[PDB]
Amino acid sequence: DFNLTLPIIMAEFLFLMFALDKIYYTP
Amino acid sequence: NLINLSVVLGVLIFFGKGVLSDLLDNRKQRILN
Amino acid sequence: MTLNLCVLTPNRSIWNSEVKEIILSTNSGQIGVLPNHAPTATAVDIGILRIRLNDQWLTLALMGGFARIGNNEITILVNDAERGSDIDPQEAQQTLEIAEANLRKAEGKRQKIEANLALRRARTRVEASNT
Amino acid sequence: PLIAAASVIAAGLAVGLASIGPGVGQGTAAGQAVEGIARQPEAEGKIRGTLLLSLAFMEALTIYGLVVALALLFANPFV
Amino acid sequence: PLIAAASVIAAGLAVGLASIGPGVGQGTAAGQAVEGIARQPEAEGKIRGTLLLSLAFMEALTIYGLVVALALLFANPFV
Amino acid sequence: PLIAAASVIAAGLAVGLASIGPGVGQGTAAGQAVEGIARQPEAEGKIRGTLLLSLAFMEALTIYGLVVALALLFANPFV
Amino acid sequence: PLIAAASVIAAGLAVGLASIGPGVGQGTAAGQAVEGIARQPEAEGKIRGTLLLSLAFMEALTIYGLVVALALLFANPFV
Amino acid sequence: PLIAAASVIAAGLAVGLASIGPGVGQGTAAGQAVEGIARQPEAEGKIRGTLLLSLAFMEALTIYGLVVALALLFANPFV
Amino acid sequence: PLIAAASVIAAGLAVGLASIGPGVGQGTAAGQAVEGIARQPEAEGKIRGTLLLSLAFMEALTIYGLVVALALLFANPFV
Amino acid sequence: PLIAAASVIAAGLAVGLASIGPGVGQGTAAGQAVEGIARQPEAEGKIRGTLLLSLAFMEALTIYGLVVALALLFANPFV
Amino acid sequence: PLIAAASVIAAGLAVGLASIGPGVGQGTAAGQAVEGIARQPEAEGKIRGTLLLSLAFMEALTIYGLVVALALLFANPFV
Amino acid sequence: PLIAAASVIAAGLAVGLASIGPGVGQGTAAGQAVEGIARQPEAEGKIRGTLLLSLAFMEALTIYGLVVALALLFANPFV
Amino acid sequence: PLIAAASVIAAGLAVGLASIGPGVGQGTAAGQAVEGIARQPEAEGKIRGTLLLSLAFMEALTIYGLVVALALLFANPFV
Amino acid sequence: PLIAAASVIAAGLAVGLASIGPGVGQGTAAGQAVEGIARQPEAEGKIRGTLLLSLAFMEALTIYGLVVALALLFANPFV
Amino acid sequence: PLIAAASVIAAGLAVGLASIGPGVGQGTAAGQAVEGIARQPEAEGKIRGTLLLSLAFMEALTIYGLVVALALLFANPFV
Amino acid sequence: PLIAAASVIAAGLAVGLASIGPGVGQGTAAGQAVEGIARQPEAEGKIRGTLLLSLAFMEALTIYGLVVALALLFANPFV
Amino acid sequence: PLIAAASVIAAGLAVGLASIGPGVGQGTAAGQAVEGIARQPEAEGKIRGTLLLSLAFMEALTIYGLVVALALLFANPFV
Amino acid sequence: VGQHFYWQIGGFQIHGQVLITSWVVIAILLGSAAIAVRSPQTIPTGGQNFFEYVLEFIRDVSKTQIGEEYRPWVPFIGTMFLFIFVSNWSGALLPWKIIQLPHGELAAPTNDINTTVALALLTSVAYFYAGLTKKGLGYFGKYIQPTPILLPINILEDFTKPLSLSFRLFGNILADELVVVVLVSLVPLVVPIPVMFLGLFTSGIQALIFATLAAAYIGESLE
């Protein structure tokens, strides 16, 4: 079953990627 | 899930502190030397 | 924390002190030797013995030989060894280059063995330039 | 009926024949890896990482078989 | 009926064919690991840790098979 | 009917017999690769890359089998 | 009826095919372990402990098979 | 009736297939153990103790199979 | 009818029995190739090229089997 | 009737499949033990004692199988 | 009817049993050939030519099997 | 009737499957024993005695199988 | 009818079982031949000629099997 | 009737399965014995005597199987 | 009728099971023969003659099987 | 009737299963015997005599099987 | 009728199962014999004579099987 | 048991289970990240030591695998690794049994096939994007260099490797889920403790292996 939860998870994961970069990874 | 999760979390917190102690000791030896 | 090692050379009886790790390289490959190792017969070859003092990774270029290795008794019948960086390091890189100079000939099958020994002798000689 | 019974037999045969060979493979891998790690006490971390990746590949094949068995068991498209 | 009987036969074949190969694998692992640990008496702790991780992978495959068998036995979605 | 049941049995046999041999192969590969990487601690990166490519080939064969099984299961052209 | 008979046949096949391979594995383990312990008379206690842990893993797989057989025999959920 | 007959056939197949592989395992163990004990005449007592423990594990698997067969034969819960 | 069901069973048996042996072959190839590439760190590129050609031959045999299975599945000339 | 006939077939299959593997095991044990006893002419008594104990374990497994066969034959609880 | 179904089953069994052994053969060939080519970096071209000829013989046997399967599938003289 | 026929089939299968593995075992024993006795020409008497004891154990297992077959044939308690 | 169907099944089984073993044989031949040709770079022409003759013998056996299959398929004397 | 036919099938299976393994055993014995007798040209008489005794044990097992087959064939107590 | 169909199935099984083992044998012969001929470049002619005689014996066994198959196919005395 | 047909099937299975293993045994014997006779060119006569005696034992087992088959074929006591 | 058909199936199974193992045996014999004859270029005539005698024994077993098959085919005493 | 969806109907069908799990997991990860790194020192303070050791191990595994330009995909690989790690940890460590979901069930993010397929498509399209950025725009690595017959085979293998990673992740997640579910459904919850410990170890190993496999596909893109 391939629902829209895939794009929801990808969108929530890219925010965590950029947020880790901004918060911890660059600092 | 509760009891097994609690036992695993206790053993994991104890051993994770024991391993992070060694990792922080390596980093501390690096910075100190 | 260590084993009685006998770095034995044709004319020399190079140091009888005793150290932690022995990563002598055979024809097959390297093997890490530490205390209470099982008694083994190894044909150590033109690779490099790196020596762990338990303080220092000091590193000996040996030319070749054999190692009869046992229970804290260990005996390495070296063809030729130089303790650590006994050769000069810039001269070590230069010896790699000047045996590169004489590897450039080719004589059939016949003296290609000499070419091989020259190139691998320089290739273990370049170790002390490395570290 | 007979369709769900044959699907169950299919899942059982799939799970058994998938778990058979991969166990033997991972065991041979572990034996030679432990012999090598005893031969050289230096690169145990990278050796354990590569062995974990390969055991993950073998367990991924085994999990693909177990997932096909669970799809046949729990929610089968046929029955 | 016949469906629960075939599910039981499935669970039995799954458990047997899963336990067969992994036992042989873990035994070969243990034999070569003990030979290596006798060859070098130094890194026995890390060797035992790596061997425990690999035996845990093999027993995890075996436990996946046993869990599929127990799901077929106790609370089967078909019967 | 019987057609979807036989297609399910086909997918199960395909998945099991595909996962059997490739696990043993990848395990033998991993064992000798780890023995070699312990013998020489130099080219571990290129060795891991070549081993990853070969394990990718084996897992690609296994994934072709699993994809044939999933095509038989989910959306079969026969049933 | 036929369901309990097939469950009994399942338990028998499970027990036999589980005990087959693990015996061979534990024997190969014991042989190479005894050869190593004869080669080095020093670490016999730790070697026996590791061998006991691995034989416990193999006998745990065998006991999982025997427990599935006893669950099929004594109190089967199907029959 | 047919149920007790099939349970008897189950017990027979279980006993035979359980005793097959473990005999070969214990024999390989004994052969390499005797070769090692001849190679080193020192630790024969501890070697015999470890070999007795491992042969006890193998005979425990065999006795689990024989006990399942005797439970099927004498007092079967099905028939 | 029965013809498409038997063609599906044919494709499943073909895919499984084709993927079984070639995985083991490619794994033995990879293991000895990695052992050799560790023994000599010089000709890794040509060794990887030859190994890629041979793995391409093995995967071509596997793809011929998978293509016969897909021809039986999707557009079968019989059914 | 058919029950005693199937019990006889069970006893025959049990006896044959039990005697098959243990003979091969005891033979491998005897071969390597004789090679070792020829290599060292000193500890022949203790080697013969350990070999007798291991052959007694193998023959005990074989006698358990033969006793299950004789219990099926002479005084069967089913028939 | 049943004739085309049995011809399809024939083609499937032929393709699988033909691809099984030749993959293992070509893999053993590739492994020992790569070990040799690593042992000697001189005659890689002639070694690759001879290995290509032998792999062509093995793939020719496999293609004969696949051609018999395609003749059974597409244009069968029976059905 | 059918009971004596099935008992005869049981005795035949028992005798064949019992004689199969023990012959291979005794042969491996004899081969390695003769290699050892050629390696050392000293302890041939004690080696022959130990080999005779082990071959007596194997032939005792074979004679137990043959005696079960003769009990099924000549004076069967069932038929 | 059934005669041509059974002849087709015969040709399929013949082709598969003929191509199975000869592929493995030719592969073992090729592997040891390439190892030898790498060991000695002198007699590669005569070695390739002898290997071509032996591979021609193996492919002649395979072609005899394929010709029997084609005689069963195209113009069968029975059907 | 069917009883004598099944007794004949029993005798045939007994004779074949008895002669299979013992031939392989006696051959392995003969090969290693001839290798040893070539290694040492001294004790050929005692080696031939011990090999004759062991081959007599193997042929005695084979003759026990052949005698059970002849008792089933010529004068069967059942039919 | 069924007689010619069973004779065709007989010829197919005969041809396949005859060609299986002899291919593997001739391949092992060729591999060790090529390894030996590479080890010694002197007696290649006599070695090729002896290998041709032995391959002629193996192909004569294979041709006896193929001739029995052709006698069953073309002009069968039964049908 | 069916009795002579089953006796013929018995003789065929007996002859095939008897000739299978003994050929492999005699071949292993011949290979190691020829390797030994090449290693030592002195005792070829006594080695050939012992090898002839052992091959006579193996061919005597094979002739016992062939004689049981001929007794089933030509003058069967059942049919 | 069915009797001649079953006799033909018997002859086919006999010929195939007889030719299988003896080919592998003669091939192993030829491989080790050629390796030995390459190791020593002196006694090639006596080695070829002994190898011819042993291959004659193996081909005599194969010819006994082929003669039983031809007696079943051409002039069968049953049909 | 029930692993389909909850009909939070917008536009088309949607699965609320992986939506809620992904929101909770990404929120917990970002909230743990920003709280101890709001003021990090050069010395490894409380959360700073753990975050720096994680960044160090990730940078080690990335610089070893991809080669030279391991810096540009480091946040992508760390996001994939930490997302899988936190999802596999929290799907097992978080109780979903006392609270009842009406429409279906909801335990973990990667339990749905769509989550693993989306992460696989992200990794595969990132690999193809790095292949288009590094290699020529005309033909990427699908070019048949060694022999002229491997173009569609290489293309199919490249299409298969993403689904291989997704199947590996789905297999691990569903294996742990079914193990916990059937072991609790067998009998009272005291028996399955060692199998649960083995499952937690397998979760950590699967996290590290997913990190390494993503780095392997990234090094293939670097090729």
Author numbering:
A (entry chain J): 85 to 111
B (entry chain I): 30 to 62
C (entry chain e): 1 to 131
D (entry chain N), E (entry chain M), F (entry chain O), G (entry chain Z), H (entry chain Y), I (entry chain P), ...: 3 to 81
R (entry chain a): 22 to 244
What does the paper say about this structure?
One sample without DTT or IBZ treatment was taken as the control sample. As prepared for the functional measurements, three different protein samples in detergent micelles were imaged: reduced (DTT), oxidized (IBZ), and control enzyme complexes. Although the density maps generated from the control dataset could be categorized into three different rotary states, they were generated at relatively low resolutions (5.2–7.9 Å). One explanation could be that the control dataset was composed of multiple states, conferring a greater conformational variability in the population and thus flattening out the high-resolution details. Previous cryo-EM studies and our structures of the ATP synthase showed different proportions of the three rotary states: rotary state 1 is the most populated, and rotary state 3 is the least populated. This uneven proportion of the particle distribution implies that different energy levels are populated in individual rotary states while the motor rotates. As such, in the oxidized and control samples, the rotary state 1 is more energetically stable than the rotary state 3.
